[PDB]
Write a protein that binds this ligand. Structure first.
Ligand SMILES: Nc1nc2c(ncn2[C@@H]2O[C@H](COP(=O)(O)OP(=O)(O)NP(=O)(O)O)[C@@H](O)[C@H]2O)c(=O)[nH]1
Ligand SMILES: [Ca+2]
Ligand SMILES: [Ca+2]
Ligand SMILES: [Mg+2]
Ligand SMILES: [Mg+2]
Length: 166
């Protein structure tokens, strides 16, 4: 069966782990344990196709930035996550996109931009701002809440549908 190598990236605390765990294990992690690098695998059916999602949950802590080249080389598609209540995390997306672009030597890497924590009312990144950024990258923008599950499957499954247009 087809295997898809997804990599979840973004600044510390944006909810990369919560999103991945919600998708794979169907619960919300409330506590905050910073990630080094974890792997998850799951067989799912997406648009009639049985496939294997291999998901890499990466570090947002900048201390671990040296590990990025390795996982950007291997990954097929990237979920670029910021939090809608964290402007700096949105500004941090460009550094991720730029390094992906370098490592892949491509302006056409499968990616989805994800605005997470949409359940929180302390929004500092408006949907339109993020839509604009995604448009410049040629990729979709989707908002999610790992807490309520809103948009979680949509985000990861869309990343799969992007890998498929390539
Ligand atoms: N209200 C709300 N909280 C969230 C959401 N997603 C994650 N969180 C919370 O934000 C904190 C950090 O989440 P976490 O998934 O560990 O973030 P991370 O991006 O994986 N952090 P790191 O880069 O250090 O590994 C946790 O307390 C978690 O419960 C969300 O959609 N809504
Ligand atoms: Ca919990
Ligand atoms: Ca692009
Ligand atoms: Mg994490
Ligand atoms: Mg503003």
């Amino acid at each position: 069966m087809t295997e898809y190598k997804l990599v979840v990236v973004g600044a510390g605390g944006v909810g990369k782990s919560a999103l991945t765990i919600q998708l794979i294990q169907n619960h919300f992690v409330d506590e905050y344990d910073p990630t080094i690098e974890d792997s998850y695998r799951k067989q799912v059916v997406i648009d009639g196709e049985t496939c294997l999602l291999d998901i890499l949950d990466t570090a947002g802590q900048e201390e671990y930035s040296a590990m990025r080249d390795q996982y950007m080389r291997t990954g097929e598609g990237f979920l670029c996550v910021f939090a809608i209540n964290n402007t700096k995390s949105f500004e941090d997306i460009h550094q991720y996109r730029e390094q992906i672009k370098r490592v892949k030597d491509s302006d056409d890497v499968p990616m989805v931009l994800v605005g997470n924590k949409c359940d929180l009312a302390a929004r500092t990144v408006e949907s339109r701002q993020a839509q604009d950024l995604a448009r410049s990258y040629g990729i979709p923008y989707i908002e999610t809440s790992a807490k309520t599950r809103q948009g979680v499957e949509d985000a990861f499954y869309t990343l799969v549908r992007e890998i498929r247009q390539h």
